[PDB]
Design a protein around this nucleic acid. Structure first.
Ligand SMILES: OC[C@H]1O[C@@](CO)(O[C@H]2O[C@H](CO)[C@@H](O)[C@H](O)[C@H]2O)[C@@H](O)[C@@H]1O
Ligand SMILES: OC[C@H]1O[C@@](CO)(O[C@H]2O[C@H](CO)[C@@H](O)[C@H](O)[C@H]2O)[C@@H](O)[C@@H]1O
Ligand SMILES: [Mg+2]
Length: 580
DNA sequence: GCGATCAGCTCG
DNA sequence: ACGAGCTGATCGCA
């Protein structure tokens, strides 16, 4: 049965009530400078559909949109807010965002449209976006009649579902998590995305030319050593050259052919000179394809800026993700790849890049939640945690810790945070399970608090059906009760890791909110540009650096109060590369 | 022809 | 190992 609504030709007072469900549709996946195809409004007076060229040109409508006292309920308000920013229109007053509400209730559901969220509450009087717009090449905006009804039904669903969603969030003690954390953060991410990051395309193009020279030299050297030419980027072709023509040892398989992962080649290097050249070839190839050509494809020709999109409702732990481009995985470990960062520059003359990062936030959060005396004392003394762990596990003095001992203690620390398992550690340290198990046993002997927490959190997950973070984020773990060892073990590791990684996410998100409030009170021009899990990157006039050196770390350190201090390191410079 | 999966890489 | 995204090659078949 069709849904009644007014297809309006002009904006009326009735459409400007102080509370309504609002839909500002942007069909393009990437909403930057993208079209708004239609608008729907549902309030106490009825349901309305408005053509964008009409509503967005109306003084009364635009004023209503920017009036903070006129409340709106929406789905993915950030998408609309940014699309409107590109048009010079401000969106205010969003008091409820169905996408974020659904995400907090159950991130595993993968809710990416109104229909998926509505299904959670047995509401199905609305179609999934894919069914209306289609997918891939077939995707397209339907004719007005079909478009208008879809938008109205989405607005109607949002109007009906607000109370049910707020009620459950309240029962979960997540009401403040949505209203005081996620929704305000949404607006901040919108500003960051809209601002974008300036790219030195000339620099990138010159690096690309040099990589082309290097790749060509290594490419030939590879054919020379193999005695023939082949597609190096083909795991299958490569597999034949290595394990058949050259007779190299087969230490591990995959599926279709042989395994040629970097880990496998690292072990084969001793046998043949072609191996080292293949590893180098792959390193350069990744930089060229992904960080040179890939980046250049998404830079705006007119402004020379890249405008990422932060997915705020995807990860199972509460972390953010980044796309088109992904600015959370720019090279830094290897020097050659790290040079890529010299291409990210300030958006204005005489401005600089400022980067601040939490030091060991995950292990600090663990010390807090586990209340391990030895680990809390370690951070209270601000000790090098990997050296300290080596001292305890191997029973030696600080002076007796060798480079290899610290390396292995470091690996034990990662396993503990990720969810420790002898197989996982053994695989990572290239040692036997028995040995890895010994390392773990030794660790728990030195940190009995962490051991009790790991045992207790797994038990809690089984009793409650989920685990939670510091700010009450939730993750359900149904596989925790599986009678299949591999499936159950994975869920146990998630029970152990989620409260750590998740609480660290909670903290940096609150820090972003606190920081923006501080920047505004101080009327600083500085503004956030990116967030990379445990680090915040800003840009500002060179004249604001000294003030930021004090303000940013403090805000980030005081975001929450834990049983151990929080530590933040910071750097600034002419490019992102220099902010170290 | 197109889209989906595998295999590889980058980051925290 | 925990949590993500992007690219080149290839297995898919409409
Ligand atoms: O707008 C981001 C928001 O939209 C979802 C779907 O509701 O993802 C869409 O947009 C992303 C950014 O362009 C794409 O990566 C994704 O493929 C597309 O479906 C949500 O997941 C996200 O929170
Ligand atoms: O041996 C107990 C020890 O095993 C773990 C797995 O590392 O959990 C197993 O035993 C529990 C009973 O004590 C079960 O609830 C759980 O399902 C099973 O995998 C640890 O959590 C526990 O300390
Ligand atoms: Mg750090």
């Amino acid at each position: 049965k069709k849904m009644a609504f007014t297809l309006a030709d002009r904006v009326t007072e009735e459409m400007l009530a102080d509370k309504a469900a609002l839909v500002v549709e942007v069909v393009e996946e990437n909403y930057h400078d993208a079209p708004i195809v239609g608008i729907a409004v549902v309030n106490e007076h009825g349901r309305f559909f408005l053509r964008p060229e009409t509503a967005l040109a109306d003084p009364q409508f635009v004023a209503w949109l920017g009036d903070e006292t006129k409340k709106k309920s929406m789905f993915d308000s950030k998408r609309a807010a940014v699309a409107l920013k590109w048009k010079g229109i401000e969106l205010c007053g969003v008091s409820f965002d169905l996408l974020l509400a659904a995400y907090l209730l159950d991130p595993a559901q993968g809710v990416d449209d109104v229909a998926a969220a509505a299904k959670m509450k047995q509401y199905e009087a609305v179609r999934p976006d894919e069914a209306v717009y289609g997918k891939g090449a077939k995707r397209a905006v339907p004719d007005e009649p079909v478009l208008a009804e879809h938008l109205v039904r989405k607005a109607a669903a949002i109007w009906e579902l607000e109370r049910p969603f707020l009620d459950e969030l309240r029962r979960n003690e997540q009401d403040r998590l949505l209203v005081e954390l996620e929704q305000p953060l949404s607006s901040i991410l919108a500003e960051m995305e809209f601002a974008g990051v300036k790219v030195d395309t000339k620099r990138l193009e010159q690096m690309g030319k040099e990589l082309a020279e290097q790749l060509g030299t290594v490419e030939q050297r590879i054919y020379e050593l193999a005695g023939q030419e082949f597609n190096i980027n083909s795991p299958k072709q490569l597999g034949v050259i290595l394990f058949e023509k050259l007779q190299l040892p087969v230490l591990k398989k995959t599926k279709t052919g042989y395994s040629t992962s970097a880990d496998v080649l690292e072990k084969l290097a001793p046998y043949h000179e072609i191996v080292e050249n293949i590893l180098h070839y792959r390193q350069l190839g990744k930089l060229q394809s992904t960080y040179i050509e890939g980046l250049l494809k998404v830079v705006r020709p007119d402004t020379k800026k890249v405008h990422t999109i932060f997915n705020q409702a995807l990860t199972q732990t509460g972390r953010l993700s980044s796309t088109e481009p992904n600015l959370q995985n720019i090279p830094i470990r290897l020097e050659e790849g790290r040079k890529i960062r010299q291409a990210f520059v300030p958006s204005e003359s005489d401005w600089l890049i400022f980067a601040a990062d939490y030091s060991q936030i995950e292990l600090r959060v663990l010390a807090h939640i586990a209340e391990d005396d030895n680990l809390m004392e370690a951070f209270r003394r601000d000790l090098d945690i990997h050296t300290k762990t080596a001292m305890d596990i191997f029973q030696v003095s600080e002076d007796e810790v060798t480079p290899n001992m610290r390396r292995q203690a470091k690996a034990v620390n990662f396993g503990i945070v990720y969810g420790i398992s002898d197989y996982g550690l053994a695989q990572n340290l290239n040692i036997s399970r028995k040995e890895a198990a010994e390392f773990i046993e030794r660790y728990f002997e030195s940190f009995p608090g962490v051991k009790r927490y790991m045992e207790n959190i797994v038990q809690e997950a089984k009793q409650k059906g989920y685990v939670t973070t510091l700010l009450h984020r939730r993750r359900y773990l149904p596989d925790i009760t599986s009678r299949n060892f591999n499936v159950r073990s994975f869920a146990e590791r998630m029970a152990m890791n989620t409260p750590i990684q998740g609480s660290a996410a909670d903290i940096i998100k609150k820090a972003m909110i606190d920081l923006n409030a501080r920047l505004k009170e101080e009327r600083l021009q500085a503004h956030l540009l990116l967030q990379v899990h445990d680090e915040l990157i800003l840009e500002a006039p060179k004249e604001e650096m000294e003030r930021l050196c004090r303000l940013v770390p403090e805000v980030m350190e005081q975001a929450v109060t834990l049983r151990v201090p929080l530590k933040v390191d910071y750097h600034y410079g002419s490019t992102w590369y220099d902010a170290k």
